[PDB]
């Protein structure tokens, strides 16, 4: 009955990677709180997006398809107005390969045309430069996961 | 409208159960096709659970059977069933398990939408009688149902 307040996504690695972690999307007053904790990432910034298809059956994560863009807008940063619904920018891994990230996304929701429920999270090998189209030159996909309804 | 749904199941702690499940919209109902590996030989409980959360080691985070009508536990062919009562999946001597059938209850939009819910494979058989689980026991694999 009660509208969806939480969303959870466990990312598993693509072929020839050890990238794993959990991402929670919690509803707050002024948007949706994104909290991500990953391991097995190479040190540095990694592309971090919601993709249109919730399919992680492919070895290379190609089955996730393109960036979740139901408004047919350009690729950008989370802070940008001109962005895809699934433009969550970059996640940064430390020297130990641990990556934490928490911020308030004002675009994502858990119901309607722009619902992220049943979509995929994709972590990329390289940095999302937030300029290049349509991907940000993030390159290969190192981890995939499907966004599910939380409690 | 969403025509297809896909769910990759990964194992819980101390299990090797993996596979892919597709839900395709067909004449009559929704065609369920499941291909699993690393299951013990025999029948295994096979359900859609209310929470799409596989973050727990033992798959407890998936919660109970997806039951938005507050009905009793039953078989897929039964009228008195949970929306996520997909019965049992059977693994051969090699631990491979295939299963295809037409479910007339599951849909990809509305109150009874399976999109964003979890698939759970159990250690033991779902007897389709015992409440509320069918005495299926421990959870060996978890996965979230996504849009195809
Ligand atoms: Cu991406
Ligand atoms: Cu179950
Ligand atoms: Zn994008
Ligand atoms: Zn049930």
Numbering used by the authors:
A (entry chain AAA): 3 to 153
B (entry chain BBB): 5 to 152
Authors' description from the paper:
Superoxide dismutases and reductases are deployed almost ubiquitously throughout nature to prevent damage to biological molecules by superoxide. They employ redox-active metal cofactors to catalyze the production of molecular oxygen and hydrogen peroxide from superoxide. Crystal structures of a Bacteroidetes bacterium CuZnSOD portray both prokaryotic and eukaryotic characteristics and propose a mechanism for self-catalyzed disulfide maturation. The Group 3 CuZnSODs described here and exemplified by BbCuZnSOD represent an evolutionary intermediary between E-class and P-class enzymes with high eukaryotic sequence identity and E-class homodimerization but P-class functional loops and disulfide configuration.
